Design a protein around this motif. Sequence first.
Motif, short mmCIF file in Angstrom:
data_model
loop_
_atom_site.label_atom_id
_atom_site.label_comp_id
_atom_site.label_asym_id
_atom_site.label_seq_id
_atom_site.Cartn_x
_atom_site.Cartn_y
_atom_site.Cartn_z
N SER A 37 -49.96 23.05 -23.77
CA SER A 37 -50.04 22.04 -24.82
C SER A 37 -50.82 22.62 -25.99
O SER A 37 -51.93 23.13 -25.81
CB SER A 37 -50.70 20.77 -24.30
N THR A 67 -41.55 28.58 -19.41
CA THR A 67 -42.83 28.02 -19.81
C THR A 67 -42.60 26.90 -20.82
O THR A 67 -41.91 27.10 -21.82
CB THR A 67 -43.75 29.09 -20.40
N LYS A 68 -43.18 25.74 -20.55
CA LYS A 68 -42.97 24.56 -21.38
C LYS A 68 -44.06 24.48 -22.44
O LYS A 68 -45.25 24.51 -22.12
CB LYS A 68 -42.97 23.29 -20.52
N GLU A 103 -45.93 22.25 -24.88
CA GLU A 103 -46.21 20.83 -25.03
C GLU A 103 -46.89 20.54 -26.37
O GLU A 103 -47.14 21.44 -27.18
CB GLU A 103 -47.07 20.33 -23.86
N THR A 151 -47.13 25.30 -18.00
CA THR A 151 -47.19 24.36 -19.11
C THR A 151 -48.24 24.81 -20.10
O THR A 151 -49.24 25.44 -19.73
CB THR A 151 -47.51 22.93 -18.63
#
Lengths: 48, 48, 107, 106
Positions: free
Chosen positions: C12, C103-104, C106, C10
Amino acid sequence: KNIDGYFKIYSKHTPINLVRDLPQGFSALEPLVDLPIGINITRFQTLL
Amino acid sequence: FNCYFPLQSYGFQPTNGVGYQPYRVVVLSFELLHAPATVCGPKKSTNL
Amino acid sequence: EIVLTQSPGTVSLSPGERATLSCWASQSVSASYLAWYQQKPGQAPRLLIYGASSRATGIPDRFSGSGSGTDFTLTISRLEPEDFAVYYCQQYGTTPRTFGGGTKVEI
Amino acid sequence: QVQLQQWGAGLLKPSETLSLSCAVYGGSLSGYYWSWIRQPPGKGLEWIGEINHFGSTGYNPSLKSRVTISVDTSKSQFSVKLSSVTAADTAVYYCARWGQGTMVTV
């Protein structure tokens, strides 16, 4: 002599019995070194 | 301010990522101009 | 057998920040056999980078790929409001074509 | 112009078989390489099989001896036939050379 990029050098040491000039005799100069200079040369000078 | 050094350093720790790692670089550049070849390969013979 | 290790799982970030996706392979991948896919939520896979250096056709110039051997790295120099999606890398240097876990991105 | 429409998906009992449909528009399936891409819920992409345009075809080891991909040049359609399905085969199958995705529940 330098021809086709190759600096031909032919050499000969020889014992002499004289003090004045070029003697009366015959011999040749086998090749010693060839250099791929590839560079024109139009002048030279000796070094003592 | 608005005057920055055009030169900066590599930071090489062994902990840096594999894409962030030092790699010794060898650049082999060849020329084949009109001059004769001078740097060749050692071919190996057979018996006589 | 080539398992692609994507990190982090993740991420962000705010818009305008530089986003880097890391993609490591268990074996060295010859000739940069790495393809990047960005999958919007509820949307089909969308190619981003081919050969790890060649971007897909019509993909924004903000996308950029990097790395060689066991490193593949996807760079988004300037984040976009629609760039918060899952990115999966795919390695096709072996017959068992395999992809990374994704892969995120955010907010 | 260029569109790949998937069909043939749905819920299937274990050990059953399935036949995929991938209608291509504007493309020559027999003249360009085609592959099928699955993605289980929450996973990444998994290349299962690919078919070379000349006719050559390959399948991933997880689908080896269970999957069969072929094309109907008479309809310019890409087909992906899987047999001996199971729970692990549940994934979203989109056909690419991409398509729209076809969820497979088993």
